Design a protein around this ligand. Sequence first.
Ligand code: HEM
Length: 153
Amino acid sequence: GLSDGEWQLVLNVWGKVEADVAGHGQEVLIRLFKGHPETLEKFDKFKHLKSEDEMKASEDLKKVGNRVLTALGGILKKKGHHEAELTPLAQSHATKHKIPVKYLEFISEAIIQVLQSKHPGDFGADAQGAMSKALELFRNDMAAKYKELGFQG
Ligand code: HEM
């Protein structure tokens, strides 16, 4: 759905994230929890945290942040051929976590906001476009495996 040029702009900015996956991960989560507080409710381990300072101090949030961006970089580096990587993820998010597709949308946004903020020189207009389409592709594939797992997304 993305051209090669677009994969290139995606892998270029991912190279900046690769240096600090956990600190990036922790920042995406705080942005999501602040923007859409309803999403904090899905994480048992730290749904009690009320503020940013508490959030920044949680070792658990960081670790989870880490897991989440690690898995995502892995998908992105496949350039669209990520069936094997997405299967396990659709399976736990549709059964265990029960993450609605609107929630994958909010985190997408959150992702784009952090990149914009940290790496504007590696995230111009075209890159922003490419990243949005790559995340859309990911949500569309997630949604297709959720249907099959009988999870109304
Ligand atoms: C970019 C999209 C996401 C990716 C790539 C991702 C990836 C992961 C991975 C790899 C794990 C660990 C193993 C597993 O449980 O599958 C995980 C855990 C989890 N994810 Fe997702 N995730 C994403 C989005 C979300 C969103 C938006 C939510 C809720 C709003 C969510 C809720 C959870 C929860 C509740 C867990 C269990 C965490 C715990 O151990 O306490 N995820 N995620």
